[PDB]
Design a protein around this nucleic acid. Structure first.
Length: 53
DNA sequence: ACAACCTCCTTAGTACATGCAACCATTATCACCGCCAGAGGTAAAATAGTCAACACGCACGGTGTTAGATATTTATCCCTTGCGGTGATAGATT
């Protein structure tokens, strides 16, 4: 039975021990000079399976 | 001379508002058939070309080997649980 009653048993920690959970936003909107960043992987001199994935 | 009035005459002007569902037929009717148009047909040559031949030449895909990645296994680590000790809350007062 326990998993079949868990959305009623594990609904109790819900009211105490009161630390919680969440995710962010992290990027910027792109792009300008100097062209040190304005380059594809072509500029790196690296292998082919890397260049596929 | 006219006026409107008595009576049933007929005429004909209208009939509230919002919305949804359904599919689009019936006619017969000589169009004759004669002429000839530019105008349908097609042979022979322009506007130009097919695809088979023998060459040409290349791409692609499958079989083979290699690569490395991934999902497993293992084991480690931390973040979490639940209870407990005792916390300065909640809020009444200063």
């Amino acid at each position: 039975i326990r998993r079949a009653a868990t959305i009623l048993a594990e609904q109790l920690e819900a009211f105490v021990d009161l630390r919680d959970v969440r995710q962010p936003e992290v990027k910027e909107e792109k792009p300008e000079f100097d062209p040190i960043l304005l380059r594809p992987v072509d500029d790196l001199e690296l292998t082919v399976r890397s260049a596929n994935c």
